[PDB]
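Preliminary data (for renewal application), flavin mononucleotide complex.
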Amino acid sequence: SHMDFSFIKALQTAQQNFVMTDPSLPDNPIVYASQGFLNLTGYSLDQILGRNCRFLQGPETDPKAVERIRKAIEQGNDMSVCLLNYRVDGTTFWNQFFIAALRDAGGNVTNFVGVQCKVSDQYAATVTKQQEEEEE
Amino acid sequence: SHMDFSFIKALQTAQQNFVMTDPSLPDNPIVYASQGFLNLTGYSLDQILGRNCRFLQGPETDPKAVERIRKAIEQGNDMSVCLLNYRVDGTTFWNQFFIAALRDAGGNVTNFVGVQCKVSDQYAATVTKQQEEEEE
Ligand SMILES: Cc1cc2nc3c(=O)[nH]c(=O)nc-3n(C[C@H](O)[C@H](O)[C@H](O)COP(=O)(O)O)c2cc1C
Ligand SMILES: Cc1cc2nc3c(=O)[nH]c(=O)nc-3n(C[C@H](O)[C@H](O)[C@H](O)COP(=O)(O)O)c2cc1C
Ligand SMILES: [Cl-]
Ligand SMILES: [Cl-]
Ligand SMILES: [Cl-]
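Predicted structure:
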């Protein structure tokens, strides 16, 4: 019914790409980020907290996927999207990332959790083909 | 307020280690498992669904961690535990895995989500040191 602190501790440490964001604060900013997340994105820790993950997007990013994400966030749905993200140095990578809407015993969204997965160009091609085939 | 099907689709496919279990069914069995999960554990798909993840544990698995997990499950808490797990061939590996309690708009636990991470022996040593230092 709550959050065991083991979750929060192993999150900041896990060599994979995890993030947690707080909807209670404005703009839903990152409160905890994994070490593998900083390895993948290349950012320092001070450039992560207090900000929303929009800084991973850029020019060549599919805005339909971004609208999908923001709709699922406004409704608090658990989703997953593959899109092109940018590191700090400007390099690009295909991020297939998940979003979970953790809710308390009252049904209210307490925190958002995000798992990012770097996928190859073949997986990106197939999943983008499906997502673009999802036309209305 | 619901589960976007993108979550379920990208779960079964993601090359990482994800699982989802249904508390509505007896013993809380696995309903969806990732491809990377089958790569890590070595099991076929038919040996996964309809079963609880106890088949990953074994002889030299810390039972205190298992009691911790089952208490957090009975209370529906989001946790994370590092423990020794076994593959199908009998080989061992240190699994630092997370557990999230997805709840609906009414606060009831709908499904459990689990992310497994294979960690080295140094990380296992440090985290097991902390968890054993957690004595009452
Ligand atoms: C927990 C969480 C993790 C997210 N991770 C990413 C990410 O890794 N890459 C990305 O492009 N967007 C990510 N997003 C989405 C953005 O943070 C943002 O919500 C998205 O751009 C839609 O919001 P907007 O329409 O206001 O721009 C994540 C969102 C959440 C809640
Ligand atoms: C979603 C989910 C994923 C789990 N993944 C693992 C796992 O990877 N390895 C493991 O040893 N136990 C895992 N467990 C815990 C076991 O499934 C089981 O709940 C645990 O042994 C405690 O239950 P018990 O006291 O009845 O044995 C997971 C549990 C859940 C709910
Ligand atoms: Cl379905
Ligand atoms: Cl091994
Ligand atoms: Cl090692």
